[PDB]
Design a protein around this motif. Structure first.
Motif, PDB file in Angstrom:
ATOM      1  N   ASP A   1       0.828  -1.207   0.000  1.00  0.00           N
ATOM      2  CA  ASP A   1       0.000   0.000   0.000  1.00  0.00           C
ATOM      3  C   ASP A   1       0.863   1.258   0.000  1.00  0.00           C
ATOM      4  N   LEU A   2       1.861   1.304   0.886  1.00  0.00           N
ATOM      5  CA  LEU A   2       2.729   2.473   0.980  1.00  0.00           C
ATOM      6  C   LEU A   2       3.451   2.738  -0.335  1.00  0.00           C
ATOM      7  N   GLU A   3       3.902   1.681  -1.012  1.00  0.00           N
ATOM      8  CA  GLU A   3       4.561   1.873  -2.299  1.00  0.00           C
ATOM      9  C   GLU A   3       3.599   2.448  -3.330  1.00  0.00           C
ATOM     10  N   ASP A   4       2.361   1.937  -3.367  1.00  0.00           N
ATOM     11  CA  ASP A   4       1.375   2.440  -4.318  1.00  0.00           C
ATOM     12  C   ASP A   4       1.033   3.899  -4.047  1.00  0.00           C
ATOM     13  N   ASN A   5       0.891   4.268  -2.773  1.00  0.00           N
ATOM     14  CA  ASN A   5       0.587   5.655  -2.446  1.00  0.00           C
ATOM     15  C   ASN A   5       1.749   6.571  -2.801  1.00  0.00           C
TER      16      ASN A   5
ATOM     17  N   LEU B   1       1.723   9.600  -5.455  1.00  0.00           N
ATOM     18  CA  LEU B   1       2.217  10.942  -5.153  1.00  0.00           C
ATOM     19  C   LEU B   1       3.151  11.442  -6.246  1.00  0.00           C
ATOM     20  N   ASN B   2       4.084  10.594  -6.680  1.00  0.00           N
ATOM     21  CA  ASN B   2       5.133  11.044  -7.584  1.00  0.00           C
ATOM     22  C   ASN B   2       4.667  11.109  -9.030  1.00  0.00           C
ATOM     23  N   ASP B   3       3.794  10.195  -9.454  1.00  0.00           N
ATOM     24  CA  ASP B   3       3.249  10.283 -10.803  1.00  0.00           C
ATOM     25  C   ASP B   3       2.411  11.542 -10.968  1.00  0.00           C
ATOM     26  N   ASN B   4       1.593  11.865  -9.965  1.00  0.00           N
ATOM     27  CA  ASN B   4       0.698  13.009 -10.071  1.00  0.00           C
ATOM     28  C   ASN B   4       1.427  14.338  -9.945  1.00  0.00           C
ATOM     29  N   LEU B   5       2.652  14.346  -9.420  1.00  0.00           N
ATOM     30  CA  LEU B   5       3.467  15.550  -9.529  1.00  0.00           C
ATOM     31  C   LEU B   5       3.777  15.852 -10.988  1.00  0.00           C
TER      32      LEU B   5
ATOM     33  N   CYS C   1      -7.243  20.089 -14.273  1.00  0.00           N
ATOM     34  CA  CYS C   1      -6.151  19.123 -14.339  1.00  0.00           C
ATOM     35  C   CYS C   1      -5.297  19.189 -13.081  1.00  0.00           C
ATOM     36  N   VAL C   2      -4.919  20.403 -12.670  1.00  0.00           N
ATOM     37  CA  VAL C   2      -4.084  20.567 -11.484  1.00  0.00           C
ATOM     38  C   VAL C   2      -4.832  20.114 -10.236  1.00  0.00           C
ATOM     39  N   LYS C   3      -6.105  20.499 -10.111  1.00  0.00           N
ATOM     40  CA  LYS C   3      -6.868  20.141  -8.919  1.00  0.00           C
ATOM     41  C   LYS C   3      -7.062  18.633  -8.811  1.00  0.00           C
ATOM     42  N   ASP C   4      -7.280  17.954  -9.941  1.00  0.00           N
ATOM     43  CA  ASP C   4      -7.491  16.511  -9.894  1.00  0.00           C
ATOM     44  C   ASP C   4      -6.221  15.784  -9.483  1.00  0.00           C
ATOM     45  N   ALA C   5      -5.073  16.214 -10.008  1.00  0.00           N
ATOM     46  CA  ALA C   5      -3.807  15.613  -9.607  1.00  0.00           C
ATOM     47  C   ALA C   5      -3.553  15.825  -8.119  1.00  0.00           C
ATOM     48  N   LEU C   6      -3.748  17.058  -7.636  1.00  0.00           N
ATOM     49  CA  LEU C   6      -3.602  17.334  -6.209  1.00  0.00           C
ATOM     50  C   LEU C   6      -4.586  16.532  -5.368  1.00  0.00           C
ATOM     51  N   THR C   7      -5.793  16.292  -5.891  1.00  0.00           N
ATOM     52  CA  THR C   7      -6.768  15.465  -5.184  1.00  0.00           C
ATOM     53  C   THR C   7      -6.215  14.072  -4.908  1.00  0.00           C
ATOM     54  N   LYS C   8      -5.590  13.454  -5.911  1.00  0.00           N
ATOM     55  CA  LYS C   8      -5.077  12.100  -5.739  1.00  0.00           C
ATOM     56  C   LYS C   8      -3.832  12.075  -4.868  1.00  0.00           C
ATOM     57  N   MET C   9      -2.982  13.100  -4.973  1.00  0.00           N
ATOM     58  CA  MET C   9      -1.839  13.209  -4.073  1.00  0.00           C
ATOM     59  C   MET C   9      -2.292  13.332  -2.627  1.00  0.00           C
ATOM     60  N   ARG C  10      -3.352  14.103  -2.385  1.00  0.00           N
ATOM     61  CA  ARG C  10      -3.824  14.275  -1.018  1.00  0.00           C
ATOM     62  C   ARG C  10      -4.343  12.964  -0.445  1.00  0.00           C
ATOM     63  N   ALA C  11      -5.132  12.220  -1.226  1.00  0.00           N
ATOM     64  CA  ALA C  11      -5.665  10.948  -0.745  1.00  0.00           C
ATOM     65  C   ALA C  11      -4.569   9.900  -0.595  1.00  0.00           C
ATOM     66  N   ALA C  12      -3.529   9.960  -1.429  1.00  0.00           N
ATOM     67  CA  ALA C  12      -2.390   9.072  -1.236  1.00  0.00           C
ATOM     68  C   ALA C  12      -1.605   9.447   0.016  1.00  0.00           C
TER      69      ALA C  12
END
Length: 107
Positions: free
Chosen positions: A3-7, A11-15, A26-37
């Motif tokens: 799980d930690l590796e996937d999160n 984080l790094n892909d969505n950067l 686009c920016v908000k959606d990427a930040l959304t997934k980084m936040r949940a990760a």
């Protein structure tokens, strides 16, 4: 830990997505997934710290890094929600310094 590796990968892909975004959604959606990760990775014990105590200085340091990281994502999310694509991207690049010095050394 899986799980930690996937999160961390989320984080790094969505950067990367953020830098090549052309609009605010686009920016908000990427930040959304980084936040949940980041909310999940925040709770995990990185493999280098498995033997450590949860109140060890390294676990405290790991958790404080994600508090900073989640704070930085929230700042960039505020800018994306105001439509400020470029400022949100500049606030996203700030995460890189926190990632290296705080979190990456423990993975």
């Amino acid at each position: 830990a899986a799980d930690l590796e996937d999160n961390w990968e989320t984080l790094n892909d969505n950067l990367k997505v953020i830098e090549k975004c052309d609009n605010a959604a686009c920016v908000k959606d990427a930040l959304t997934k980084m936040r949940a990760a980041a909310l999940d990775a925040q709770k995990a014990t990185p493999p280098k710290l498995e033997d450590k105590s949860p109140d060890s200085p390294e676990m405290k340091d790991f958790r404080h890094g994600f508090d900073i990281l989640v704070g930085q994502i929230d700042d960039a999310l505020k800018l994306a929600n105001e439509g400020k694509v470029k400022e949100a991207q500049a606030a996203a690049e700030q995460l890189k310094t926190t990632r290296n010095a705080y979190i990456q050394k423990y993975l």
